[PDB]
Design a protein around this ligand. Structure first.
Ligand SMILES: [Mg+2]
Ligand SMILES: [Mg+2]
Ligand SMILES: [Mg+2]
Ligand SMILES: [Mg+2]
Ligand SMILES: [Mg+2]
Lengths: 218, 133, 257, 123
RNA sequence: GGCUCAGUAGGACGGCGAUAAUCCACCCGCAGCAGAGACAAGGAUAACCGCGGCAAGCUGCGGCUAAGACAUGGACAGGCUGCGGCGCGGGGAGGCGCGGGCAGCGGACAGGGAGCGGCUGCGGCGGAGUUGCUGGCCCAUCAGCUGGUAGGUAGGGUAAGGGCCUACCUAGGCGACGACGGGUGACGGGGGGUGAGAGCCCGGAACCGGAGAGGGAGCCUGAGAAACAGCUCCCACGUCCAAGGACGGCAGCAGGCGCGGAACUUGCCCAAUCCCGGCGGGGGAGGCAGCCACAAGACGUCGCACGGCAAAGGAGU
């Protein structure tokens, strides 16, 4: 049984092929349980894991919150763990596994919560980057401490050339910005506002003209 | 007696009793205007409207208090033989209490298409003519 | 079957469209716009069968892409847009303004009108209903709606509405002695003066009409479209002028009386 | 001997639709160009229609005003008749069906799907 | 759309109506869309970056990240319900529309530098559900049938009237003017055949309506399905497996087998006819060709160029 272990704060992840006698120490545990690395091996002393998911030698997922170790057939909607719903409102009956670990499980997914004493070269030494910087302007201005006046996509390309080390070729990352006050936004609101009052006086004009033409005394 | 307190519609526009004119060039009976009955299925003092076919038939059965069986006898022409056939259909017709005692077995009764009042009741007695008259 | 019918067979198409039997299996199903399907024709029939601007749908797509078609003063870049009776098709290329109208052969015909007659159209009212806040807005048979009209405008009246202005500029009532156009029926596409109105409480008011020639016929008032009062016609009349000459009159012109 | 039956002007489609009856008792578009001030490329004849006995072929030919409106408005096969553009390949109908039907079952990008496929094929 | 006609003898269909007993997407015409810090909107997730499980079908873990997705903000109106209640309009007929009331709820724009797009309501259009009257096969060696059956009251339920359902109560309801039951190698109709006609017979088959997707039942999503080239399960057949599991519904198009007397090519293409999509796309709908003396009609006793064709072939020189 392998051990798919990831580090969230480091973004690194590798498989740890533990031996058979380690696997029997992990039986009866469930998802969300936190195991100390002393249970796994001496090479993981001081670590704290958290079991997130698992898989099967038949390929099934290990569904969270079933509380069996056996293969169970469950009827899943969209967004339910263990079913990738393709068409709208289509429910299927998928086979999953309950959260309890047993001998049937091929791989156990877990994350590092607390870093142990000795480093793991794939997992502790490396740092793997966050794959995407935000699109929202409020999320970008807090991340780079951007001036409120300044152009956002300009201000980052300022910063890349500043902290570049004589690089003749610099490719930039994917920078698109959403949810920002722009002159197209302000022009649309003021136009919609002035038309709302223009409709009100025009409708009130046609009520007066109707009350003048066809009800002239009142 | 009654399961609910007997209540009529609020008369819009004897001004203490609700009664409407059903239209189609008909009249409200004075037993409906000056009456105390609270039949909700009545065409005049109740919650039904008359729309669709208005036919005239003869009362076949006056049993089973509020409904009556009205037979409409008609002729159907067989084109091969070039003769007619005497046919009929019986209708379960709602008889309002404004016609109680007025309508008896044999009278020619004009019935108007209401809602589906019961399972088999789609007509209500809107007027009548006595057999002796 | 059951649901919104997306297709339309060629034989099931209205015969006023004058589509042939052997043209294909399907006919263009109109979009569900302003006129009813029994009283409308699509744009795509007029631009290939009547005006023959496009012989192909590829040509027809180009004409509606470049937005040269404009009906009732709106561009209407839809292939299956239902144009109906009294609607004005105005194309700025060719400067051709036409009003859709019926013929004596019980078919739709595009009648060439002036540039000044294209500025308005006639609409028969459907109902008259007070809106929220007391706005008395009436509704026409072609799905248009106008507010703050004359209070004398009641049902079955035709109103002269401006095209370039959304208001109603002219009112024509439904009395006896009015020039009427027969929209649906056996006498479809006949122009006559209303002789009598029979009311028939409950259903189906009947209008009695004699034409200009003197031939008398009876129709439902729902099939009666007023086009003028006693002195004047509010629209131009098409070719043939709604006379509906008899079959013996067609016989007598070929061989003498 | 050529004679024009009817001459009609399609102003929205920037062309002239004319019907000609050509007769040969006992190549076509050349002398038609030697009637009006038009190039040979501006000449598109829809179809040649002939009665059985007489040598009187009827041609319905179009008179465009620009080569660009011609290749835009007219159908793609008739410009293959004049010049043989073949601007869109559109490989074959049976190839395009299988090419699209394979793409339909692929969730995600093709590169994630082909990588996971050969990674399992490598094992 | 296409296919098919098993079921269906009235849940159909046709004709004439009704919906004042009802719901609604596209589209069209109108009115409108909360100042809230507002030069403004919050947390996510897929894609993706990695790491995987698994024979296959399929699926997990981690990391980030969008909106016309999902929220927040903010109520002038429409709306709902109860009570009150005069009128003005429409309609054959009214608290149907609208104005005027008191309450309890509730409720429409924080979008974009290729055209705009959202949402609420009224009116259409396009649909749809119910429904009334009526007509249409055979058998009397089928003569009595009926218990939610017929009605009442009341509630429930529904988009909606209703024994539709329930509670209580009446004893009704239909029948030789043929009920009820049975049969049908019965989808109905527009129609077709045949006869001078009256008739008789047929309607699988172009169009319209219905019904079905191996037999069923249940449902999700959606405006609309009790959908089936959606799901869930059962049954009957069939397939793959590494034996843990995974699948199949040609009464779509060709094609195969079987059945029988009895019925064509696993051809080409969106060119025409049209449909879906907000356009470039897709369409075995559909067309073209091939097969067949199956039918209608016309006419006798071999190869270029031309011509047309999406392309080819045929017609025509
Ligand atoms: Mg994930
Ligand atoms: Mg995650
Ligand atoms: Mg059968
Ligand atoms: Mg049939
Ligand atoms: Mg059919």
């Amino acid at each position: 049984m392998k051990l798919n272990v990831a580090y969230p704060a480091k973004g690194t992840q590798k498989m740890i092929p533990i031996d058979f006698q380690t696997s029997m120490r992990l039986y009866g545990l469930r998802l969300g349980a936190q195991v100390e690395g002393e249970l796994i091996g001496e090479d993981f002393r001081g670590y704290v894991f958290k079991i997130t998911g698992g898989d099967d030698v038949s390929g099934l997922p290990m569904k969270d919150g079933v509380f069996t170790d056996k293969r169970v057939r469950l009827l899943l909607k969209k967004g339910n763990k263990g079913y990738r719903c393709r068409e709208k409102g289509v429910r299927k009956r998928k086979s999953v596994r309950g959260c309890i670990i047993s001998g049937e499980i091929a791989v156990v997914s877990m994350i590092i919560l607390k870093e142990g004493e000795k480093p793991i070269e794939g997992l502790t030494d490396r740092v793997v980057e966050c794959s995407h910087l935000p699109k929202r302007a409020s999320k970008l201005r807090k991340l780079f401490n951007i001036p409120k006046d300044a152009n956002i996509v300009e201000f980052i390309k300022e910063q890349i050339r500043n902290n570049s080390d004589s690089e003749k070729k610099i490719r930039y990352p994917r920078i698109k910005v959403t949810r920002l006050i722009t002159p197209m936004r302000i022009e649309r609101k003021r136009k919609r506002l002035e038309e709302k009052e223009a409709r009100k006086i025009k409708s009130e004009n046609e009520r007066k003209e109707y009350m003048k033409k066809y009800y002239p005394e009142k | 007696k009654a399961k609910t307190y007997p209540k009529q519609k609020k008369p819009h526009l004897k001004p203490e009793r609700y009664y409407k004119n059903i239209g189609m060039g008909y009249n409200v009976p004075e037993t409906a205007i000056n009456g105390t009955y609270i039949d909700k299925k009545c065409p005049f003092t109740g919650n039904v409207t008359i729309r669709g076919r208005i036919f005239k038939g003869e009362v076949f059965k006056m049993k089973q208090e509020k409904t009556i069986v009205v037979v409409k006898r008609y002729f159907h022409y067989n084109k091969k033989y070039k003769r007619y056939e005497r046919r009929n259909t019986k209708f379960n017709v709602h008889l309002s209490p404004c016609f109680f005692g007025l309508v008896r077995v044999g009278d020619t009764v004009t019935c108007g298409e209401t809602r589906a009042l019961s399972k088999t009741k789609h007509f209500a007695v809107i007027d009548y003519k006595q057999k002796d008259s | 079957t059951r649901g919104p019918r997306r297709h339309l067979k060629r034989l099931n198409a209205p015969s006023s469209w004058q589509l042939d039997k052997l043209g294909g299996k399907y006919a263009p199903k109109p979009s569900s716009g302003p006129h009813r399907l029994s009283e409308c024709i699509p744009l795509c029939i007029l631009l290939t069968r009547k005006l023959e601007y496009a012989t192909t749908t590829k040509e027809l797509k180009y004409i509606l892409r470049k937005k040269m078609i404009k009906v009732n003063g709106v561009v209407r870049t839809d292939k299956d847009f239902p144009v109906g009776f009294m609607d004005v098709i105005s194309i700025d290329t060719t400067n051709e303004n036409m009003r859709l109208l019926y013929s004596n052969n019980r078919a739709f015909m595009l009648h060439n009108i002036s540039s000044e007659e294209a500025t308005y159209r006639l609409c028969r009212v459907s109902k008259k209903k007070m809106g929220i806040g007391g706005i008395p807005y009436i509704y026409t048979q072609d799905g248009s709606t106008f507010r703050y009209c004359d209070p004398k405008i009641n049902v079955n009246d035709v109103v002269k509405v401006n095209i370039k202005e959304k208001k109603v500029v002219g009112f024509l009532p439904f009395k006896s002695g009015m020039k009427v156009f027969i929209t649906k029926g056996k006498n479809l596409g006949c122009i006559g003066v209303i002789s009598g109105i029979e009311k028939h409480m409950g259903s189906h008011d009947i209008a009695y009409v004699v034409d200009a020639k003197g031939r008398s016929f009876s129709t439902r008032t729902s099939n009666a479209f007023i086009i003028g009062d006693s002195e004047s016609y509010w629209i131009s009349l098409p070719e043939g002028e709604g006379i509906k000459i008899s079959e013996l009159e067609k016989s007598n012109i070929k061989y003498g009386e | 001997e050529t004679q024009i039956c009817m001459m009609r002007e399609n102003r929205p489609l920037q062309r002239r639709e004319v019907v000609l009856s050509i007769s040969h008792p006992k190549d076509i578009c050349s002398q038609i160009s030697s009637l009006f001030k038009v190039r040979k490329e501006l000449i598109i004849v829809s179809g040649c229609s002939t009665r059985f006995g007489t040598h009187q072929t009827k041609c319905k030919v179009r008179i465009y005003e620009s080569p660009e409106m011609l290749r835009e408005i007219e159908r793609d096969f008739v410009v293959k008749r004049k010049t043989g553009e073949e601007v869109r390949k559109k490989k074959a109908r049976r190839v395009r069906k299988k090419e699209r039907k394979e793409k339909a079952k692929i969730f995600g990008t093709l590169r994630r799907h082909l990588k996971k496929a050969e990674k399992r094929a490598q094992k």
